[PDB]
Design goal:
With 284 residues, this protein is an alpha+beta fold. It is 36% helix and 18% strand. The protein has helices at residues 50-62, 93-97, 104-123, 174-177, 185-200, 210-219, 231-240, 251-254, 258-263, 271-283; strands at 3-4, 10-17, 23-29, 35-42, 71-77, 80-86, 91-92, 126-127, 136-138, 144-146, 153-154. A 6-stranded mixed sheet has the order 1-5-6-4-3-2, with helices on one face. A hairpin with a 5-residue loop joins β3 (23-29) and β4 (35-42). α3 packs antiparallel against α5 and α5 (185-200) packs antiparallel against α7. It binds the ligand Cc1nc(Nc2ncc(C(=O)Nc3c(C)cccc3Cl)s2)cc(N2CCN(CCO)CC2)n1 and chloride ion. Ligand 1N1 binds next to β2, β4, β6 and α10. This is Serine/threonine-protein kinase 24 36 kDa subunit. The active site is at residue 130. Mg(2+) binds at residues 135, 148. Residues 10-260 form the Protein kinase domain.
Length: 284
Amino acid sequence: NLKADPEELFTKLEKIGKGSFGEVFKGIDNRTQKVVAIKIIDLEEAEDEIEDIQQEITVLSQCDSPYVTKYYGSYLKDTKLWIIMEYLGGGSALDLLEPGPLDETQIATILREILKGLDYLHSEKKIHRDIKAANVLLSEHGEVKLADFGVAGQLTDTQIKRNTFVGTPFWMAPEVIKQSAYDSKADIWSLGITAIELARGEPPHSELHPMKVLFLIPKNNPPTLEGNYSKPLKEFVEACLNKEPSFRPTAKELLKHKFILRNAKKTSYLTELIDRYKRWKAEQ
Ligand SMILES: Cc1nc(Nc2ncc(C(=O)Nc3c(C)cccc3Cl)s2)cc(N2CCN(CCO)CC2)n1
Ligand SMILES: [Cl-]
């Protein structure tokens, strides 16, 4: 369902990011005047990532959830491919960390919405494989959605596990680094690392070279959350960061975890964080 002539339907506005894959622009849906995000990739300079792009578009085209960035479509325009998504204006969860620490209500609220996204994806037999705060985006009023499906994987009846080495090293599950047969439980490990990232501001080993953690993670005991945090938060992290994937809970099970039930509140309260970042960035 590749479409054509994107500028008949969208207005391309200013660059807002990226990067490695391509360049990302703000845009307008001319039909509704809603704002969109447009990733433009020139495919005559592709040339190996082309297979990954095809996979990314496939995954995007099959997702339909409040907890995953809304996909408008992929458009051919001469030599270039336009990947068009809803624009979320609140920043990423990583951005929201920059001015300072979160409290456990904010951490639980964000984790609960990530979990609803993971529950959705995993129920569709999809694996995100790059869960981290940078890939968790917020609307300007605090809605929280998963983004960047650039390395997302799909399980099928004939392929019940993946084994591809993808992800971001600090957040990668040990079985992914080992290139063992793995599934959605890899996302649950990454969620654990993300919980530490939300609590501490950065993942375990964050001051080491990424290549070095590739040997450390499979060997070392799993990270724990250290510091003056509630016991249920520490337990939530511990549950996620089990070396044996089958011992990790599902996303569905974690939604009922004491940490989430006791501390998560309305997403609209996250506007406080969004405002904090806006103030901070304006003074930086
Ligand atoms: C880089 C960036 N994106 C933003 N919102 C997005 N919504 C959806 C996105 C998305 O779907 N991208 C994407 C695409 C399009 C294809 C493949 C894969 C992916 Cl990941 S990106 C907001 C933002 N700003 C807001 C907050 N700041 C001001 C504070 O003062 C800074 C600027 N900056
Ligand atoms: Cl928004």
